Amino acid sequence: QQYECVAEIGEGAGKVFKARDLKNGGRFVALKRSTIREVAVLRHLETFEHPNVVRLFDVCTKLTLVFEHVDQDLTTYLDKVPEPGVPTETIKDMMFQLLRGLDFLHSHRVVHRDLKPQNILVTSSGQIKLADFGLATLWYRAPEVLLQSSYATPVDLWSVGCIFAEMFRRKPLFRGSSDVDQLGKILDVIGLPGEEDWPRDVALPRQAFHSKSAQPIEKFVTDIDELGKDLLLKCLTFNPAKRISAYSALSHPYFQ
Ligand SMILES: O=C(c1ccc[nH]1)c1nc2ccccc2[nH]1
């Protein structure tokens, strides 16, 4: 064949294979098995070669997508990082890149929808690359998706908040086990929202939760400076309309 399989890196989405690219120097790639539209969109994004998204190298034809392989993801990086964890400035750098990648996507009307440490890739030189977007665990899901009310771009900024926190904590902020658990565990930290921030005509009303009050976020994210707290909270806003965008996030003072 033109590629040659070696491992599974691996499962979702659903399988991702590490493969030898025989034609191009035996380098490692990642092979992946409205369609030709999503594919078309993916090729159009490639034309911009944004440095914070995985490169698409080839499309073969049922459907095999050939992407850039990177040795680790954020999960494995947070695993192996020595105590006392990710340096403050490294967290700040990795966040900027994350939001850069995301804004690039959002600005080209692509919503990721499943951001998590497992498809945030971390290059040996420390470059952040987003993977596993543009094709078709609730700990990273936004409220509006749990509630099944809206699926616009803000959905991904909620996931960014969760990741930001986890870069400090080295463990997830919201480890729910069901949509309803997840929603519960979220409001336990951020508090019950105003009645007019609660989506209209969804199955779950505000009154299905008695998660009294907002607890100060630094109790859960020890290490976090004042500015990170501000940013993190603007990301973890209940109302998608009031949530900060990737674009505004790029200008937040936290990144001065
Ligand atoms: O290179 C990767 C990829 C994913 C999607 C497209 N490329 C990739 N490298 C990985 C390393 C560890 C865990 C997951 C990984 N996933």
- Residue 247 and residue 156 share a domain: yes
- Residue 104 and residue 57 share a domain: no
Asked which of 41, 71, 101 is the last residue of a domain, the reply is: 71
- Residue 104 and residue 66 share a domain: no
**197's tokens:** 């921030």
- Catalytic sites, residue numbers: 114
Residues 98, 125: Cα–Cα separation, whole Å:
15
Residue 240 Cα to ligand 1 midpoint, Å, equals 29
- Residue 96 and residue 66 share a domain: no
- Residue 224 and residue 143 share a domain: yes
Annotated binding-site residue? 26: no
- Residue 175 and residue 124 share a domain: yes
The verdict on the CB of residue 131 being under 6 Å from ligand 1 is: yes
Resolution in A: 2.3
Question: Position of tokens 């899901």?
Answer: 141
- Residue 128 and residue 99 share a domain: yes
Residues 232, 128: Cα–Cα separation, whole Å:
19
Angle between helices 154-169 and 226-235 (to 10 degrees): 140
- Residue 107 and residue 10 share a domain: no
Phi, psi at residue 25, to the nearest 5°? 75, 15
Q: Are strands 128-130 and 120-122 parallel, antiparallel or unpaired?
A: antiparallel
| Residue-range definition of the domain harbouring residue 38 | 1-71
**154's tokens:** 């803000």
User: Could you write out the three-class secondary structure of the chain?
Assistant: CCEEEEEEEEECCCEEEEEEECCCCCEEEEEECCHHHHHHHHHHHHCCCCCCECCEEEEECCCEEEEECCCEEHHHHHHHCCCCCCCHHHHHHHHHHHHHHHHHHHHCCCCCCCCCHHHEEECCCCCEEECCCCCCCCCCCCHHHHCCCCCCCHHHHHHHHHHHHHHHHCCCCCCCCCHHHHHHHHHHHHCCCCHHHCCCCCCCCHHHCCCCCCCCHHHCCCCCCHHHHHHHHHHCCCCCCCCCCHHHHHCCHHHC
- Residue 68's closest CA among 18, 108, 8, 106? 18
Asked which of 38, 71, 104 is the last residue of a domain, the reply is: 71
- Residue 193 and residue 94 share a domain: yes
- Residue 118 and residue 43 share a domain: no
Q: Which residues in the chain are followed by a discontinuity, with C-to-N distance exceeding 2.5 angstroms?
A: 13, 33, 61, 136
* Technique used: X-ray
Phi, psi at residue 231, to the nearest 5°? -55, -55
Query: Of ligand 1's atoms, which has the minimum distance to the CA of residue 118?
Result: 14
Phi, psi at residue 182, to the nearest 5°? -60, -45
Annotated binding-site residue? 32: yes
- Residue 36 and residue 134 share a domain: no
Instruction: Kindly list the strands in the beta sheet with 56-60, ordered across the sheet, starting from the edge strand earlier in the chain.
Output: 3-11, 15-21, 27-32, 64-68, 56-60
User: Domain with 55 in it: what CATH number?
Assistant: 3.30.200.20
- Residue 160 and residue 109 share a domain: yes
Phi, psi at residue 240, to the nearest 5°? -50, -35
